[PDB]
Structure 1
Amino acid sequence: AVTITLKTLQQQTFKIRMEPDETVKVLKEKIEAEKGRDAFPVAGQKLIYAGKILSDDVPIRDYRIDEKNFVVVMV
């Protein structure tokens, strides 16, 4: 029951909820459902947390992302 905060390179902010065990790949899928496959296709997504790139197969709980900071989604 965790909430990720996402910023795009168009100064847009938004929130995605997922379970701790769901992977970065599923975060990308949820971003795509929320923002569209035209502009945020899963394949083209790079998720950047604290200046480094999140890895598709890793459960999100494993990064211990504080809800204070944000994840940047780049394409």
Structure 2
Amino acid sequence: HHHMLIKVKTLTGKEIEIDIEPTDKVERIKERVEEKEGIPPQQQRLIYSGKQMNDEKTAADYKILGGSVLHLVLALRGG
């Protein structure tokens, strides 16, 4: 139905397009990324408009619309 074309920037700045729906759980977005890029979902950390995107919530309740850009992000343990 909805057919939203969102983008995801990887930790290297590579931009990829994903087709999703407002009902799609964050889980699935991660699976869409893995499918294109091989990034295991367990390692993915998605950030949209400042918010850390919970696997169990959906695309709708992050207000992710059409051309939205998600950003994969990391926190590094060593120093």
User: RMSD between aligned alpha carbons?
Assistant: 1.5
TM-score, structure 1 as length reference: 0.83
Question: Retained in 2: the 8 A contact 1:5–1:67?
Answer: no
Q: Which residue of 2 aligns with 1:43?
A: 42
User: Is 1:8 the equivalent of 2:7?
Assistant: no
Identity, % of aligned pairs?
32
Q: Determine the C-alpha separation between the residues in 2 that align with 1:46 and 1:73.
A: 5
Is the 1:5–1:70 contact (alpha carbons within 8 Å) kept by the matching residues of 2? Answer: yes
| Residue segments in structure 2 that go unaligned for 5+ positions in a row | 75-79
Q: How many residues align?
A: 72
> What is the aligned partner in structure 1 of residue 53 from structure 2?
54
Structure whose alpha-carbon radius of gyration is higher: 2
For structure 1, which runs of at least 5 residues remain unmatched after alignment?
none
